[PDB]
Amino acid sequence: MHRIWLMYDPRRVMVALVGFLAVLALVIHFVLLSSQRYSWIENGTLGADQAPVGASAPAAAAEMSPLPPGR
Amino acid sequence: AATDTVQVGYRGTAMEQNYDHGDLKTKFAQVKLPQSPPPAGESPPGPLPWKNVQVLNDISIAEFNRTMIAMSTWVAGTGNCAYCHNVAAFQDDTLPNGKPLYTKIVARRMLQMTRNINGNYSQHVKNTGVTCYTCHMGKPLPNGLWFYSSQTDYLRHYLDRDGARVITQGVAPSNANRSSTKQAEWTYALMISQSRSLGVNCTYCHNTRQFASWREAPPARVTAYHGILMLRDVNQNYLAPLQPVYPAVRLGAMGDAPKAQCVTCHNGAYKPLYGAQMAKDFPAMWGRADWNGVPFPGI
Ligand code: BCL
Ligand SMILES: *[C@H]1O[C@H](CO)[C@@H](O[C@@H]2O[C@@H](C)[C@H](O)[C@@H](O)[C@H]2O)[C@H](O)[C@@H]1O[C@H]1O[C@H](C(=O)O)[C@@H](O[C@H]2O[C@H](CO)[C@@H](O)[C@H](O)[C@H]2NC(C)=O)[C@H](OC(C)=O)[C@H]1OC(C)=O
Ligand code: HEC
Ligand code: HEC
Ligand code: HEC
Ligand code: HEC
């Protein structure tokens, strides 16, 4: 299977691999950070018994409002 | 293919209404030809015989019968007293089966609503006024009926919402106004609906160089604001509480009653019925002590 490196130049494959792993990790971290259950920066300290479950409703927050008070 | 234009602001500001001349003539003739003509009216003496009359207490017996003929032709087609009544017993509010005559008990509320419009909202309807014909136009259902659907539906500006302003009345940013650009999109959507409801463009009520300006705007903007306040009263106090009265075929998916909006009266014209003055001919519906100096012929 090492002959894959004879048909593909490993110089080019490793850039595509690094880029693919980079976008995949970033997508998954951003997906989780936007979820209710896994917003670890705000709620990471909650125990698993008190983390959100079933919060899949597609409009959990008010769509329309003023900006927060501006100070 | 000729275009009619009306200038509504100062020279060179391009505050103008444009109409396709052919399209407008067909719309206008389509009003003229069906426009229902009024009975002549007359002046007897004598005391009122009515068994179950609760709104029209204050008009002569001839004026009452004249009003019922009008109501028939405006809502149900002419002489169709069977639409509202158990015609053997006009005083009844129920069928012989005991089941209620829902149209009659709605129509009694629609009389109070019409009087309330013509009386308390004269800053909007002035001396044109409204009759049943304005909305119904000869049919049981008016145009532009609306029901609950989504929270951000802009037609709730005509019911239970209030604020629409988004522009700051000062040069610098302030905590007074934290409106989002999304809120300006919401007002813009609302304002397109009002423009289409009258068949006008934004320059009919605004100088668009400053939408917030009242001095630069035509006076129609002040009439338009009173229209919003009128619809909130019409919807909140008269149309929406009729929910338990209608058959479920009339109700919305939330079970709510049908509500009105600008297009319900205006039907795409700058005034309802292009300004046809009918309320003056029917004192039963004035809600007002005189109509343009003509005194109410009370009993
Ligand atoms: C609450 C925690 C989150 C979560 C948070 C994160 C975060 C945050 C990250 C990952 C990352 C990854 N997650 Mg995870 N992840 C969750 C649940 C899962 C589930 C699952 C079905 O439940 C799976 C399959 C995965 C799988 C993966 C991998 C694709 C990846 C890291 C290893 C890797 O690529 O190695 C190579 C190995 C594989 C791709 C195979 C995985 C292991 C399997 C079982 C081995 C068998 C053969 C395999 C299926 C063959 C597939 C074909 C491939 C070409 C190899 N996660 C839950 C929902 N996961 C990281 C990432 O994206 O890195 C790039 C990352 O940063
Ligand atoms: C529909 O129902 C209303 C009920 O309120 C009747 O209204 C009556 O007449 C009004 C002038 C009055 O103000 C009101 O209080 C009431 O007295 C209306 O006339 C219609 O009547 C028919 O259905 C009635 C109903 O309630 O189901 C029915 O009346 C029933 O009840 C009364 C006692 O309240 C009793 O006298 C009747 O015998 C009884 N009848 C039946 C079939 O259940 C009316 O019956 C009669 C005889 O009038 C219905 O009308 C007819 C022609 O049958
Ligand atoms: C609904 C659109 C109706 C049409 C069509 C007709 N009538 Fe009517 N009628 C209607 C209401 C809402 C009322 C009550 C008014 C009030 O102030 O409460 C009435 C009342 C009458 C009466 C009085 C009966 C009584 O209580 O003694 C009469 C005599 C009457 N209406 C006659 C009448 C005629 C002749 C009609 C067609 C030509 C007619 N009505 C149509 C509602 C509606
Ligand atoms: C708009 C400002 C209207 C005025 C003026 C009048 N009516 Fe009305 N009517 C209006 C609406 C928005 C509705 C609800 C429509 C529906 O889906 O039912 C109605 C309804 C009625 C009905 C019931 C029709 C039916 O369900 O078959 C009746 C009988 C009725 N309206 C009578 C009526 C009368 C007598 C009016 C003037 C005195 C009148 N309407 C004016 C809107 C408006
Ligand atoms: C009269 C029939 C108008 C038409 C046509 C247009 N607008 Fe309007 N505008 C009108 C009124 C009565 C109001 C006040 C509404 C309220 O509830 O307070 C407004 C308001 C606006 C605003 C907000 C101004 C502010 O101070 O933030 C904007 C931005 C606005 N209108 C824009 C707008 C657009 C884009 C229009 C055509 C598509 C338009 N208006 C037409 C009256 C009328
Ligand atoms: C019937 C109950 C109506 C409702 C709903 C709305 N309007 Fe209205 N409007 C109505 C009448 C009978 C008239 C004529 C009054 C007169 O001047 O003789 C009007 C007039 C207007 C105008 C003035 C048109 C002009 O001459 O420039 C405007 C700008 C207007 N109406 C706007 C408007 C808006 C924005 C409405 C919903 C928010 C609305 N109308 C509803 C009757 C009724």
UniProtKB/TrEMBL annotation, chain A:
Membrane topology term: Single-pass type II membrane protein
PROSITE patterns attached to this UniProt entry: ANTENNA_COMP_ALPHA
Cell membrane as UniProt keyword: yes
Residues that span the membrane, as ranges: 12-32
GO molecular function, one term: bacteriochlorophyll binding
GO CC terms in record: organelle inner membrane; plasma membrane; plasma membrane light-harvesting complex
Domain of life of the organism encoding this protein: Bacteria
Gene3D superfamilies: Light-harvesting complex
Record protein name field: Antenna complex alpha/beta subunit domain-containing protein
UniProtKB/TrEMBL annotation, chain B:
Amino-acid positions noted as binding heme 4 in the UniProt annotation, renumbered to this chain: 124, 262, 265-266
Residues bound to heme 2: 110, 132, 135-136
Residues holding heme c 3: 124, 128, 204, 262, 265-266, 271
Binding site for heme 3: 191, 202, 205-206
GO aspect biological process, one term: photosynthesis, light reaction
A GO CC term attached to the entry: plasma membrane light-harvesting complex
Keywords: Electron transport, Heme, Iron, Metal-binding, Photosynthesis, Transport
Binding site for heme c 2: 83, 102, 110, 132, 135-136, 250
Residues given in the record as heme c 4 binding sites: 157, 165-167, 191, 202, 205-206
Binding site for heme 1: 68, 81, 84-85
Regions crossing the membrane: none
Binding, heme c 1: 51-52, 54-56, 68, 81, 84-85, 108
Post-translational modification: Binds 4 heme groups per subunit.
GO MF annotation terms: electron transfer activity; heme binding; iron ion binding
Source organism, top-level taxon: Bacteria
Physiological role: The reaction center of purple bacteria contains a tightly bound cytochrome molecule which re-reduces the photo oxidized primary electron donor.
Protein name (Swiss-Prot/TrEMBL): Photosynthetic reaction center cytochrome c subunit
Source organism: Gemmatimonas phototrophica
